Amino acid sequence: SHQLSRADITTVSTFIDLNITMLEDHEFVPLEVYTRHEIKDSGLLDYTEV
Amino acid sequence: KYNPSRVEAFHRYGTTVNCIVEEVDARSVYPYDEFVLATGDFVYMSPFYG
Structure with missing residues (x-):
């Protein structure tokens, strides 16, 4: 009869x-x-800096 | 520093008044009822008192 593509x-x-x-x-x-x-600055005073 | 002029075998007192104005960082923690200065001096008063 005829051929067909697979996606058909x-x-x-x-x-x-x-x-x-x-x-x-x-x-x-x-x-x-x-x-x-x-945390270092959270201290109200730093003895080193003072 | 002013120190007394020499006199022989005498105790001498010398006064020096150096007016100082220093801008410092001041810091306060909760409940902010006191704050410190960079000089490590505490101020027992709220920063916001007015």
Whole structure:
């Protein structure tokens, strides 16, 4: 009768989709609630400076 | 510094008054009822008293 392209026929999935997505790279920046200097400055007086 | 002129075998007192004006950092912590100066001198009074 005639030839057919494969995309011309409806395709049903025999496969089970498992969609695993990689845990993306993440960068942890240097984060501190207080820096060393802050804690040093938190003192009302510094004996060295005084 | 003013020191007394020489006289023989006498105790002499000499006064020197050096007026000083110094700009300092002053700091206060909660409850801000006192603050210090850079000279380590405490001021027992709220910065905000007015």
